[PDB]
Structure formats: C-alpha cells, structure tokens
Amino acid sequence: MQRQFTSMLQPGVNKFSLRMFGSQKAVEKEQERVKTAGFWIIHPYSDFRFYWDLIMLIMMVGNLVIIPVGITFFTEQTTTPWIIFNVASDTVFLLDLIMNFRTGTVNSSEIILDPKVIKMNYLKSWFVVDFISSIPVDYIFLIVEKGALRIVRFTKILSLLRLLRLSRLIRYIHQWEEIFHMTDDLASAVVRIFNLIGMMLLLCHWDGCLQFLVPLLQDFPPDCWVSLNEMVNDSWGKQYSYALFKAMSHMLCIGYGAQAPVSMSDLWITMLSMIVGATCYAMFVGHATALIQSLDSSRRQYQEKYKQVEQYMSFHKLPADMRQKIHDYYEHRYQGKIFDEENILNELNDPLREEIVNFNCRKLVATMPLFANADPNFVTAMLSKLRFEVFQPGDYIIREGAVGKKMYFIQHGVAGVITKSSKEMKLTDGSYFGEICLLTKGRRTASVRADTYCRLYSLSVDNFNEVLEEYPMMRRAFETVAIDRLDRIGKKNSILLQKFQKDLNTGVFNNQENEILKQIVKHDREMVQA
Amino acid sequence: MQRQFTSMLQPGVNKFSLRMFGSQKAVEKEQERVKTAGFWIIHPYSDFRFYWDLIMLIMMVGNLVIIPVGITFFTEQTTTPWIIFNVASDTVFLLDLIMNFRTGTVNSSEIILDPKVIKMNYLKSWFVVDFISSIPVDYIFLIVEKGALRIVRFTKILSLLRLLRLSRLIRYIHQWEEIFHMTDDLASAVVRIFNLIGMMLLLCHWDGCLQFLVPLLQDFPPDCWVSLNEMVNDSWGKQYSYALFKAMSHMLCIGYGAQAPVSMSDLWITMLSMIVGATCYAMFVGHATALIQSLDSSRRQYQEKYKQVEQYMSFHKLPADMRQKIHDYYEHRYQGKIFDEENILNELNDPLREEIVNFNCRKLVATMPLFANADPNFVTAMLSKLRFEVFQPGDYIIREGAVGKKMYFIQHGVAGVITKSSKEMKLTDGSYFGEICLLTKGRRTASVRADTYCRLYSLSVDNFNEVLEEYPMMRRAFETVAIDRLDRIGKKNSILLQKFQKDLNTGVFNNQENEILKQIVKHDREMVQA
Amino acid sequence: MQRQFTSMLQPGVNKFSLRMFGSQKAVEKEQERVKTAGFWIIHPYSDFRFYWDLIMLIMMVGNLVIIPVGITFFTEQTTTPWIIFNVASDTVFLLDLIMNFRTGTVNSSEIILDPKVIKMNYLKSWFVVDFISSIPVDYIFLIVEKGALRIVRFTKILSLLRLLRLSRLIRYIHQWEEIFHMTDDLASAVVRIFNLIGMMLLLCHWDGCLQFLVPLLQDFPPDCWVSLNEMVNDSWGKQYSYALFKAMSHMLCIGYGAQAPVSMSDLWITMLSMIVGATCYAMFVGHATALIQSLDSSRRQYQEKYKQVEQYMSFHKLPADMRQKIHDYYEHRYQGKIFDEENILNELNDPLREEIVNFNCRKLVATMPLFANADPNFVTAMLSKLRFEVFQPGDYIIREGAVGKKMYFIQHGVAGVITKSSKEMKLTDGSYFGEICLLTKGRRTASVRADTYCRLYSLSVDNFNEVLEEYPMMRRAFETVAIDRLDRIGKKNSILLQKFQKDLNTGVFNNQENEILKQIVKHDREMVQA
Ligand SMILES: Nc1ncnc2c1ncn2[C@@H]1O[C@@H]2COP(=O)(O)O[C@H]2[C@H]1O
Ligand SMILES: Nc1ncnc2c1ncn2[C@@H]1O[C@@H]2COP(=O)(O)O[C@H]2[C@H]1O
Ligand SMILES: Nc1ncnc2c1ncn2[C@@H]1O[C@@H]2COP(=O)(O)O[C@H]2[C@H]1O
C-alpha cells in the first residue's frame, strides 16, 4: 500500500510529463529525485496532486455557493446539520493547507527542497490568505466571548472570512485549465467562455447575498428596500429570489429592483454594485470578441492574401480578362487554403520529408516504369528534388527552340506534344517530357500545349545533373528512351547517337539491362499511344 | 547646497537617460550643455523635473476631486479654512507656471534655448490655458465688484475655471506613464485600465456636481428634481450621494434617478450626460478588448501556425496515421512554443551567439573527449556551425549506401547502428556518427536507426570541410577513430588506410599526440560498449 | 471669364492629381482630354467639382437638420418664410442633379463619354433616388388636389420624401473623406469617430421627430404619450425637447420616457427605435475598438517581439544572468523601436541609399583622414558596404590567433587593443582595426576588448577585397599604415614587408602620395596616442 502511495506521490509518465521532460530517462530521474526524501514529498505533476486539486476544486465551488447564502438568510445558524457541514469543510481545508506545506513548486527546475526553500516561499506567498480562510474563526471568537446582539452581528460578519477560500480556486484553476485545455481550438474556447460566465454568476450570487446582508445587519430600518417591499416575513426562497433579481438587474444594468433606493446604505451599495457590473460586463464583451476573432482566423487570412493580390492587379491596371484567369489559377492551385509550403517542409526533418513526398507521389512511382524498376535510394533523391505546378488549359508549357532548363512529370490531366509534320501526340497521367533537352544541352525539340487542367511535377536541371551524375544507369535508360522518342518524332540528335554507339559497344550493358530497356521502351510506346 | 541644486537640475544617469543617450559621454555632454546657462535651466529628464511632476500630479488630483464639490454644495464659501486652501493651491500652481517657463522641451535634440525659443514656444502653446487656471479670478472679480445675488451666482460660476487645471494633468501623465510604464506586459496594462477607470470616476464625480449645480443657480425652481424629491433641506452628504447616483445612473445608462425629468434644464442636462456616458463606456469597452487581445497573444499565434499546418495536411489529404506523427513531431520539437530561431540568432552579435551556443552545448563539450581536449577556437567554430534536430522513434537517420552529406552529434536518446553480420551497437548521449563518409567522400557504411526519441546536433559537409581544413590535427584524430571503428565494424577503407600510413610514417605525430589518440580510442571503445 | 471656367472644369495639378497621374504630362493629357468636348464637361478631380461637393454638403446637412423638425412641430407650414426656404433648397438640388448629369465618373480610366455612357450609367444608377428628393412633390400634389384633413395629413407625409437627400450626402462624403483624410493617423481617426457620432446624433434627431410625428397624424388620441403627459398645448421647444429626450433614451437604452407605452402605435415605434439604437450603439463600440487598436500598434508589436525572444530564452532554459545581458543588448541596440532595416534599405533606390548612408556616417568620413582624402566614388562604395553593430562592455571583439573575416570602424565608445608585452592601447571614435589580417590573409595579430559600450561599423572581407581590387591606391595606404602599426606593436609580417619593398621601389609612389601617407601615419600616431 505504501509502495502505491510512493508511486502516486512520484511523477508519473503522462503527456504533460513527456512534454515537460523530453525523454523517459528524465522521468526516471525525477522519480529518483522525489525518492530522495522520505515518505513526505509530492510532486506538482503527480496524479496525487492532480486528484487533490480536483477534489478541492469541487469542494471549493460547493462551499462558495453555499456559504454566503447560509450566512444572510439563516438567522438560526447553530443547528447540528449546519455545524457538521462547517467543521467538515473546515477540516478538509486544513488538510489542504498542510498538503500546501508538503507540496513543491517549479520556478527553471522543479524545487523539491522541503524544510527551508518551499517552506519559506509558501510562508512568504499565501499563508496569511489561506490561514484566515481555513480555521473556523466564528466558533473561536464565540467561545472567547462566552468565556449580545452586537456579538450576534459580529458572528454573522466573520463567517464571510471564508470567502477568502476564493483565491485557492483561481490559483488551482490556473494549473488545471492549462493542463486540461491544451487539446483543441473549440474546446479551449468553450471552456474559457463558460469559465467566465461561471465567474459572472458567482459574482451575481455574492452580490445578491450582499443586498440582503446589509439591510439585515441594521435590523431592517423602516426605509430600506426590504421593509419598503414588506418582505421581512416572507419565506427565504422569496427573499433570496428577490435579492438575486435585484443584484442581477444592477449587474446587467437593466434597472433598479424598486423604483429607487432611498436610504443611504442602499444607495451606496447600489452604486458599488453598478460599477462592478459594468466592469464585469465590459470584460465579458472583450472575451467574446477575442473568442470570435480566434474562431474566424483562417478565412480572414485568406481574404488578406486575396486583397493583396487584388491590390497588385489594381496597381498594374490589368484588364479584367486577365484578372479572371489569375483568380481562376489561384482557385485551381490553392483551393482556398492558405499555407506556406517551403517553410513547413523546411521545418520538418529528413524522414518526415521523405515519407510525405512518397505519399504525395505514390501514384507516379507506380505508373512510371522507371520509378518502379529503379533503386529506392535514387528514387528517393529524385523524388525529394521535385516541385509542384498547376497549368491552366491551353497555354504552352514548353515552346520549341528555346533554351531548356527543367523537365516535367505529368501527374494529372492530359497534355499534348505539337510537332510540325506530326499530327498530335497526347500524354496521359504518368509520363515525362524534357528528357532530351537536358541530355543534349540544346534547344527544345517540339512544343507542348496543356490541353486539360494539368497538375505537373517539375525538376530543375542542376538537381537532375547531380542525381544523374550520382547514378548513371538511369542516364543510360533516359538516353535510350529519348533515342526512341526522337526517332518517332522525326528529328535526330547525333550527339546522343554517338554517345550511345560508344556506350552500347563498350559492353557495359547487360542482358537484364537491355531486357529492362526493351520493357521500358515498349511501355513508352504504350503511354504515347494512350 | 547650490551645487546639489545644480546637480539636481542637470540630467542624471538613469535607465531612461542611457536609453536616450547611448554612452555616458553623452550624459556628460548633456551635463555641460545644461551647465552653459546660469542658475536657471532645468532639463526635462532631471530628477527635479520628475519630482516636480509627481508633486504637481498629487496636488492636481487632490484639487480636481475637491474643487467642484466645494463649489456646489458649500453656499458659505468665504470661510477662513476654505480661503487658506484656495490660496495655497493658487500659489502652488503659480509656482508650477513659472517653472513651466523655466523648463525645456525636446523636439531631434533637447532644446535648451531659454529667452527666445522655449519662451516663444510655451507662450504660443499653453499659456492661456494655464494662466486662466492659475490665479484665483474669483477674488479679483469680487474685489473689483466691491470696489447682489447675480454677483453671488457669478462668483459661484468662475471657480469652475480652475477645472482647466485638468490639461496639465494629462500633459504630465503622458511623460510620467511613458517613463514608469515601460517595464512589463501586466503592469503597463493594469496601470492603463486603472488610468481609464480613474478618468471615468472623475467624470462621474464632475457630472454629479453638475446635476446639482444647475438647479442651484436657478435657486431651486419648483419643478426640478431637487424640489420634487424635496431635498433642499437635507444635509450635504445626502445631496451629494443622490447627485452622484443620478449621474452614475445616466453614465452607465441604467435609468433616470427620478421617474422622469420634467423641467427643460434637467431635460437637456440629462441628454448631454447620456451622450457623454455612452461615449465613455464605448471607449472603456474598446480598451478592455485591446487589453485582452494583448494578453492573449502567444497562444493565439501558436494556434495560427497550427491551423496553417492543418490546412496543409488537409490540402494534400494525408491519412490520419501521418497527421498523428506530424503533430507528435511538432509537440516533441517546439514544445508548444512559437519562436523563430534563425532570425533571433541573426539579430544577435558574435559573442552573444558564442555564449548561447556554449550554454546549449555545455554537456556535449564535456562528454565528448575530443571537445574536452581540443583547442577552444576550433571548438568554438565547430560549435557555431551546428544545427538542432529531433528524430522520432524508429526511423532511419542514415541509410546504408546513400551519398553522405552531414554528420550528427547525439545529445539525447540512444540510437543504434544496424550493420549486417553485426548484432547491433547502441550509442548513448555524447557520441557522433558520420565521420568516415565525410572523410572518405563515399557511400555510407552502415545504417542507423533511431531507437528512442533522439535529439541530435547535425553539421553539414561544407562547414566540416572548412573547419577541418583550417585545423588538421582534429582531422588526424577523426581519421584514427574512424580507422578503429571501421576495423570493429568489418569493412575497411584503403583510401584512409593509405592516407594514414603515409601520414603516420611522415613523423608529424608526437608522443603527446598518440597518447591523446590512445585515450580517445579507448574512450570510443567505452562509449560504443556503453 | 470663360477661360477661367474652362480651367476650373479641367483637372488641376494637385497632390491627389499627381498621385493619380504620375507625371505632369498625364495632367496635360487629361487637360486636353477634357478640352475635347465643348463647354460642358467637368472632371471628377476638378476644383469645380470639389467646391460643388462642399457647397452641396453644407446645404445637405443644413436641410437634413431643419427638414424633419419643420414638418412635425410646425402645423402652419404655408408661411412665406418657409416656402422661400423650400423653393431655395429645391432649385439648389435641381442644380445639383443637372450637374450630376454633366459630371463624369471613373471606373480603369476616367470615363468622359457624355451623351451615351455616363448618361446611361447615371440613369441606371441613382436617378430615381435623386429625382424623388429633388423637386417639391408637396406643392405639385397640393395644386393637383386643388385643381380635407386627410389631404393635410398627406401633405405632411410627403415632405419626408426629402429625407432621400441623405444618399447624396454619404455618396459625396465617400469621395470627400478619401480626399481630405489621407494625411495622418490621428486626424483620420478623429474625423472618422466624429463622422460616426454625427451620424448617431442625426439618427437621434430623426427619431425624435418621428416619436411626435406619429401621435400627430392620428390627431393625438387620448392614450398616446403626448396626451398622457398633457403637452399638446406646450410650446414647440418643450415638445421637441421631450421628443428628443425620449428618442435618446430609447437609443442608448436607458429607459422609457414615460413609465411605459400603452397604445399600440407607441408600442411598436418604441420597439423599432430600440432595435435601431442597439444596432447603432454596437457599431459605435466596434469603431471605438478599431480606433483604439489602430492607435496602439507600435507598442503592441514591440511587445510581440519581446515575448518571442522571451519564449526562446525560456525554451533553452538560459540563466537569468544571461537574460539580463540579452535584454540589455536589445535595449542598447534597438532603443525600443521595432523596425526592419534590410527590407527598407532594399525598398529604397540607389541615391536614396547613398544619401542615407552618407548622413549616418557623416562623422566618420570627417574624423578618419583616409575618408577625408580619398576619392568620393571609392568613399561611396566603401560606405555602401557597411553594417551596424553594438558591443556591450567587456567582451572580446577580435581574439588573437583566430581566422580573420571582417574589419571594424569605430563610431562610438573606446575599445582597447590588448597585446602581450604591450601595456594597452586605447582607440577613440574614428579609427579602424582589422587591416592587417585581411591584407596578409592570416591570423589575428592581437586581441581587442570592448571597454565602453561600442557602436561599431563592420565591413566583410569579400566586399573589402572587391573595393580594394577596384582601386589599389587605398590598398597602398592601408599597407603603409599597417606596416607602421605592426612595427609599433612588435610583430612583423614579411609578406607585406616584401610586397611594399617591391611596391615602393617600383616607382609607382609620388611626392603627393607619400606626403599624404606621412600625414596619414602621423594622424594614426595621434589617434593611437589619443
Ligand atoms: N513523340 C513524342 N511523344 C511524347 N513526347 C515527346 C515526343 N517527342 C518529343 N517529346 C518530348 O517533348 C519534349 C520537348 O522538347 P525537349 O527537347 O524538352 O524533349 C522533348 C521530349 O521529352
Ligand atoms: N561499430 C560502430 N559503432 C558506432 N558507430 C559506427 C560503427 N560503425 C560505423 N559507425 C558510424 O555509423 C556511420 C554510418 O556511416 P558513415 O559512413 O556515415 O560513418 C559511420 C560511422 O560514423
Ligand atoms: N598598436 C596598435 N594600435 C591600434 N591598433 C592595433 C595595434 N596593433 C594592432 N592593431 C589592430 O588590431 C587588429 C587585430 O588583429 P588584425 O590582424 O585584425 O589587425 C590588427 C590591427 O588592425
């Protein structure tokens, strides 16, 4: 049993524990660091301190709802049932104060030095504002005065010293909400707004007890609101309902309960309640505004970027024909989602980038035969050096005769090769153009027009040269496929022809090599016919 | 004593003085610049002007609380006690006006030209709106009319000309709050909201004096609210409490004090008070919103970045299995703290970067024997060219056979070398892999799998070549340790073997050199066994 | 006179004209473009249209204040004075409608096509909502019914059709405020909030006329608020004050004028007025919040950056000793001003950058003798390739023996050279170290410790090599000064010695050259003694 107590008092492996400590070795280190001292110390992340936090929070909200109401409307406050509840909550919060001695804080590292450091820090921090609210001063002062209507007044007053149990509630709810509200966007916001409206109802309830308490301590003078409305004799449900209604009407600023307040005490209490209500309502409106702006962030940022590009198009005074094509492109590329890609892919590390890239191009590695038959290290490097692009229908991707600087891998949407003295050649998903320009270091062979809405993957020339100089068997493959494709087109490149005639006669090719090559070129005939 | 007066009037070395002036030579320059003119000039950063600011602010808030109340409810305003206070505050603000002549402003540099520049600027800026509020016009006009109920009315009016002492309060509180509120985020916000609620209570108090002042100047006509509620005879505490309650109920918009206002004067004053109250409450709600959004900034920005990466993962339609790993990585790397590292480390200078890097890697310089025994300039350069990384459990850091481009220093969490025909080899904190790939310019020797949650420090190949070409003794060390590690693994590199056989036989090695090398290789056997 | 009319109708050279048109040639182009058509067309930037805008705005706010009040409380609306004012404002707004025909809009370019384009666009845009409000329908319908208490009711109604003069006011105030409110931050904000509170007082006034208008059209039934308060006979000042007070109490939500509204008409008008008041007050609170957040921007952004660097220091868990030095550095460098320097200096062009750099370094070009005697093109290039730095007291700028990569120009604050077997050497403002390391391509000669708070200007090695390879006479100067400084230090560099012994014996030096060199080295002895 005591081993279970020690394992409870030591910090346990949890999500917050891992977020604090990093590796589990730090959790074992903290477990031994707690296991230094004997039978006493509890850690501020332990499940014992968490459950004691929760039990004391339930008891606190219970007592702060039932304390003030009990004081005002119950002029017989010496009943056995009432005294039993009072001493129960008293010994419960004395337990919580001694555990507040035997806890430990976190400045830096978590301080676990009991007899000097945490004792001095706690005795300098909150011991007065807890020791007033702990012990029942209402029975001590009563047995002192026993060892009298003014004394009955004074023992009705000092019970409100237990309202200083409030500071423990906010001091605990700080830790509790920061632990159990870091989950999502909706849940944290909704628990924060319900936190605030719970605070507002607590203040309305306290004020509703106050507006009857002060006409009670003066024994109901004949001009205050209670003896004007003639409800000194009405049963306590009616008095509490009216006092709470009066405080809620002051709080939301609707109006005075009665026509007006005439006595001086009622007048000043009404004014103080009005100030507190206006301030709390202003804070509530501010929190509602902050919650709304936190919910509406993404659409706002997208409209910011849209207004920026609209201002750019306005500054150059482009025609509306072009603005329609630009907004069509932004829709067809970003799909109404604002995000920066290079920054995120720079923030992630190498295997996360490799796994994300392999998932985004899982279709292309299957559909191209080259990627299906090549080595996975080459495939991974060539895949890592790619770039997304979106082409609108009917614009030239590659024009003939210009200098070549990249190649493109088709992912979605058919694009056509338009060679003169050739009809047309369509290219489905899973194919590539831009081979022979980069392999021959010359001018583009035949132009390419984007028929449908193409979604292409492009690869620059320097990365292509680095990868294909690392592994040259794929360069032999590209040379052979480019030879067949050029022979079908009609033009021929003697540089690549002589390089292959010196390459194939050198004997570096194998039986499996040219069998794979024959498979690839018949596959290329298939994905140029289709 | 006069030397103390001159040292008070000259600017003193303070935090604001250093933030204004840079070096202390500018403070000495300003001290001589004040010491040019004789016995007169005070500087707008001097402790004399600061203490005169504070004393005049205390006297101002005192007088603006007690002036209007004194006017309305005290129809016997010729008492000795009242006249003594009036002439006291009068001569105090005449002192402040003459010191307002003998001050100096700051446009650019601080102007200290007395007899033309600052005299012309002050006499064109605020001299009318101070000279009205300075001298007691209420006794001058009275002794003029002595040298009569309308005259008693007129001498009750002109005392409100001292409410133009208000502009000096805001004009001073600008400087005072910008001096003593640049400390932190909570303190500046709380003093700003209490500044605004102090302003609102001041307006409520002034309006509460007004609502009795205007039924007073008409000698209480039989239809205004005072003679309707029948409180012309009630003692002044009751009249002030009711007038303040009526103005506060108009201000927060709760309701008319009485059922309605019937006389025309009460009607128009009620409407003007309603407008001023609605405007001031709107400003208060705006300031509360701005304060709340200023407090809730960091969690907001973190949720912005989180929503952005969520939109990226939504756009690529990644499976939830991968989204869980990405959110796990972001938690395990940033720990819920949004900050940009490269920008901050670019903003700091060279010794701050060196000191921060040495503190972040104080454990690694002790645990690695190479760093413990090397020269501190080399250690500092190699430390400056490092980069943080976080690896999740069970992904390959380095795969075998790929091209090598960096090396890694383990900081936290064990990672394993998985070589074929070797069992496994664990590596604790404080070790490095990636030596022999960069030293032999070839393929990776054996793959490395991240067992626990690794926190690694990585170093790129170009920086490694620059540092190790600057100092080659560490390259001899790395060559020897790599030779031993390869001999234990099973593969061997003849390039490094021949380079060391030509290196060691060259005679460049020394007795201390290979003694240190023997210590390092037995240390490497220790941190590969462990 | 007609030439003055044509020059008024044509667009004039103004600040908005230059911001619209760029060069003055476009203003002359627009002047001829207006001068195409004859005697008719006015341009929407012309001073004629601006002054007609202003005169119609004055007349509009006058009429919309005096129209509704005239309708309700003046049951004798056939007086000569009243009819004269009505036909005056009628013919004034018929003038404004015909000028609304003869104007021109701006879609793109400013359309100036009169008889089809602007006529069709205006007749499709606003001609109904102006032609109702232009002509006095109240006299036309009266002379129709003349060519009867229901008819008197109907001629009291249709005058409110002139409230549709309101749309012209907002349609003009759009252009007028965007012209004359682009000046500053305070003026635009204050005119916007006073614009909104003017709109709110206009709605309060209109509602105050409505609450008496509807009990007027039913001939004051015996249960509406007017005949309950018994003010059918009170003179019109009293009725207007009470009706405006009732509408203002509904508008700000304070309370019903009377105890409650009993008749059905009063009930529904009260509810509609409550809805309009709550909506307008919500808009006012929103505009106040936006104004406050616009005023408090700079301090907010500075606190954002400060919280970010605080989160960075918290994430690395640096000691508070280091956090104090970092916050000291940020204060001493940015001086509490958030701004990005590289972005702004990238946005400006070449002579603006040259002029800004020459002003920031006007002291250094005078204090250094090299800059005073060198060619201004060299001085400008070397000045353009500089970088600011701030060094805290007591850290080593340059350590001995390390590799050299930049040189530093002292601007403010003394720094010391600490050479072994030399006492110490102080360097005032206007001096440079880092010459001989960059000139000899080797290790740093002697360390340098920052004594006071140094503000230095640094220059990198690649820019230094580019400039000093462009002009080599300054390299001869640096070689000679470095020779003297090394001879005084104690170490000597044979590379520079032999390069100068081959350089000086080559005969490239002149009499003016070595006279300038002698002046520079005695100046260097002066600024090393001092
Ligand atoms: N018949 C064809 N079928 C498919 N693609 C082709 C054909 N002819 C040329 N191409 C591709 O179109 C590209 C355009 O010019 P390049 O020189 O970049 O390389 C060319 C080939 O990749
Ligand atoms: N037996 C071993 N123990 C620890 N590390 C090793 C061992 N063998 C190889 N390594 C490291 O693992 C690295 C992986 O391949 P590299 O060529 O980068 O260089 C290798 C060495 O740094
Ligand atoms: N006696 C000296 N007085 C002033 N500066 C010096 C002196 N000796 C060396 N320096 C400077 O200090 C620099 C530090 O090393 P460098 O090699 O960069 O070049 C050195 C010179 O610019």
UniProtKB/Swiss-Prot annotation, chains A, B, C:
Intramembrane region ranges (chain numbering): 240-261
Subunit composition and interactions: Homotetramer. Heterotetramer with HCN2. The potassium channel is composed of a homo- or heterotetrameric complex of pore-forming subunits. Interacts with KCNE2. Interacts with the SH3 domain of CSK.
Residue ranges annotated as motif Selectivity filter: 253-257
Comment field on protein domains: The segment S4 is probably the voltage-sensor and is characterized by a series of positively charged amino acids at every third position.
Alphabetically ordered keywords of this record: cAMP, cAMP-binding, Cell membrane, Disease variant, Epilepsy, Glycoprotein, Ion channel, Ion transport, Ligand-gated ion channel, Membrane, Nucleotide-binding, Potassium, Potassium channel, Potassium transport, Sodium, Sodium channel, Sodium transport, Transmembrane, Transmembrane helix, Transport, Voltage-gated channel
Expression by tissue: Detected in brain, in particular in amygdala and hippocampus, while expression in caudate nucleus, corpus callosum, substantia nigra, subthalamic nucleus and thalamus is very low or not detectable. Detected at very low levels in muscle and pancreas.
Effect of G286D: In DEE24; results in absence of hyperpolarization-activated currents; reduced amount of protein at the cell membrane
Protein name from the UniProt record: Potassium/sodium hyperpolarization-activated cyclic nucleotide-gated channel 1
List of glycosylated residues: N233
Protein source organism: Homo sapiens (Human)
Positions bound to 3',5'-cyclic AMP: G434, E435, C437, R444, T445, R485, R488
Activity regulation, per record: Activated by cAMP, and at 10-100 times higher concentrations, also by cGMP. cAMP binding promotes tetramerization and formation of an active channel. Compared to other family members, cAMP has less stimulatory effect on HCN1 because part of the molecules already contain bound cAMP and form homotetramers when cAMP levels are low, this inherent tetramerization in HCN1 results in a weaker response to increased cAMP. Inhibited by Cs(1+), zatebradine, capsazepine and ZD7288.
